[PDB]
């Protein structure tokens, strides 16, 4: 369950194994994180 | 392409072709109007959402409607072969 | 009106519609009582695996 | 947002003509001559090149982290 | 008979002398529809941070034309299982990067995009994109991305004659069918007429316009996927296949 720190655009990355009070990234105090795209191949038919 | 026959007779025929758009129907209508003996030939697209045409042929009785359709197909094939031969030399 | 379907197939008026679903893990009076966000195993009202 | 690959009316590629047309029009040349000598004579393609916004330049700043 | 008018880049204009209008229209319709052209069918996205979503990018890749003159015989038509593969794997570093169609690596070297100047997408800072597209032959009936011609025209053969000298006809007619040389009204491009009848409307007695029954003008503009002559030949071949199959079914029914 990897995450991404929302500071600027796609600031580094986070792992759920990292434990901090509340929701924060260790790198900066920004309070917003996002889930990353899962590393799986996706079939997208071109209509 | 599926084919279905309706109201077939010696001089009158109706025939539904599934899978052909306006192109084949118009080609066949032109060749049917070209072949002698055919009193009235016309295709129709009953619904544009469905890709299936209906060809109605009425003949004077000298030749069968199915034979008239076959002659029209032969004429169209001759035209296509001539067109290929003339384009290749161009 | 009649619209060219070939134009539509080239992206003439293709659009995207975005819908948002949001929740809050609200805490209500009690002993450390919270609505923890977690996948469900065997609790009541279970929709189906 | 980004210029379409092909003209909507006729399936003619106009995406590759965006950069030359835009660069030369921004340089100080009237769009008519640039379009005529670029290789687009049908006005269906001209409206594709003329009426474009290039939103994608602004969006790359506001991109979903995903 | 077929007479070439002008053969420009990706454009072909012919005059057909003895062919019914129905056959010529069927030829143009089959050129748009029933000629197979290689194009992207499915896209596999390993990673996508681009501003464009997955479906938008897949559509843009599908609309990109690939040269497939030698791919018709080496690849099975869709009615028959052999698909080409094209890779796109790039990443920006610190500045926006507009990635074009030239950096579309293909498994088969003969199959490449028509032009390398086609801009696929623009990437922001530190944005990586990686995908594999599976190209497949297909007809224009299934989708318009498979059409080999951007435009196909079938129009009547014009016969325009000047009867006396008229100064208005040179400026009335939208086409350059009329010219005024040495104070005489003459026709420069007779075959450029479109039978608009403005030339006849403002000066009725000075000019006579008619259409030639047997002759027609057939124009096709390719997109680079195929040669125009090959497009016409393939359209005629598809018409022949359809007619032969219909004849076989009619004979079987009898
Ligand atoms: S373009 Fe041509 S034939 Fe008649 S009215 Fe206009 S002249
Ligand atoms: Zn951070
Ligand atoms: Zn156009």
Curated annotation (Swiss-Prot), chain A:
Bound cofactor: record note: Binds 1 zinc ion.
InterPro entries on file: RNAP_P/RPABC4, RPABC4/Spt4, Rpo12
Biological process according to GO: DNA-templated transcription
Catalytic activity, as annotated: RNA(n) + a ribonucleoside 5'-triphosphate = RNA(n+1) + diphosphate
Essential cofactor(s): Zn(2+)
Localization of this protein: Cytoplasm
UniProt xrefs under Gene3D superfamilies: RNA polymerase ii, chain L
Family membership: Belongs to the archaeal Rpo12/eukaryotic RPC10 RNA polymerase subunit family.
Subunit structure comment from the entry: Part of the 13-subunit RNA polymerase.
Protein function: DNA-dependent RNA polymerase (RNAP) catalyzes the transcription of DNA into RNA using the four ribonucleoside triphosphates as substrates.
UniProt protein name: DNA-directed RNA polymerase subunit Rpo12
Organism for this UniProt entry: Sulfolobus acidocaldarius (strain ATCC 33909 / DSM 639 / JCM 8929 / NBRC 15157 / NCIMB 11770)
UniProtKB/Swiss-Prot annotation, chain C:
Gene, per the UniProt record: rpo2
Family label: Belongs to the RNA polymerase beta chain family.
Quaternary structure annotation from Swiss-Prot or TrEMBL: Part of the 13-subunit RNA polymerase complex. Interacts with TFS4.
Subcellular localization: Cytoplasm
Residues included from the entire protein: 736 to 784 of 1126
Name used for this protein in its record: DNA-directed RNA polymerase subunit Rpo2
Top-level taxon: Archaea
Function: DNA-dependent RNA polymerase (RNAP) catalyzes the transcription of DNA into RNA using the four ribonucleoside triphosphates as substrates. This subunit is involved in DNA promoter recognition.
From Swiss-Prot, chain D:
Chief location category: cytoplasm
Listed GO biological process terms: DNA-templated transcription
UniProt GO MF annotations: DNA binding; DNA-directed RNA polymerase activity; zinc ion binding
Cofactor: how and how many bound: Binds 1 zinc ion.
Database matches in PROSITE patterns: RNA_POL_N_8KD (PS01112)
InterPro entries linked: RNA_pol_su_RPB10, RNA_pol_suN_Zn-BS, RPABC5/Rpb10
Record keywords, A-Z: Cytoplasm, DNA-directed RNA polymerase, Metal-binding, Nucleotidyltransferase, Transcription, Transferase, Zinc
EC number: 2.7.7.6
Binding site for Zn(2+): 7, 10, 44-45
Catalytic activity: RNA(n) + a ribonucleoside 5'-triphosphate = RNA(n+1) + diphosphate
Gene3D superfamilies for this protein: Homeodomain-like (1.10.10.60)
Cofactor needs: Zn(2+)
One Pfam family named in its UniProt record: RNA_pol_N
Localization: Cytoplasm
Cellular component terms per the entry's GO annotation: cytoplasm; DNA-directed RNA polymerase complex
HAMAP family: RNApol_arch_Rpo10 (MF_00250)
Entry similarity comment: Belongs to the archaeal Rpo10/eukaryotic RPB10 RNA polymerase subunit family.
Function: DNA-dependent RNA polymerase (RNAP) catalyzes the transcription of DNA into RNA using the four ribonucleoside triphosphates as substrates.
Assembly notes: Part of the 13-subunit RNA polymerase complex.
Record protein name field: DNA-directed RNA polymerase subunit Rpo10
Phylogenetic classification of the source organism: Archaea, Thermoproteota, Thermoprotei, Sulfolobales, Sulfolobaceae
UniProtKB/Swiss-Prot annotation, chain E:
Positions that bind Zn(2+): 82
Name this polypeptide is given: DNA-directed RNA polymerase subunit Rpo3
This enzyme's EC code(s): 2.7.7.6
Catalytic reaction annotation: RNA(n) + a ribonucleoside 5'-triphosphate = RNA(n+1) + diphosphate
Alphabetical GO biological process terms: DNA-templated transcription
Gene: rpo3
Enzyme superclass (EC): transferase
Organism, scientific name: Sulfolobus acidocaldarius (strain ATCC 33909 / DSM 639 / JCM 8929 / NBRC 15157 / NCIMB 11770)
PROSITE patterns: RNA_POL_D_30KD
Subunit structure, as described in the record: Part of the 13-subunit RNA polymerase.
Positions annotated to bind [3Fe-4S] cluster: 173, 193, 196-197, 199
Subcellular location: Cytoplasm
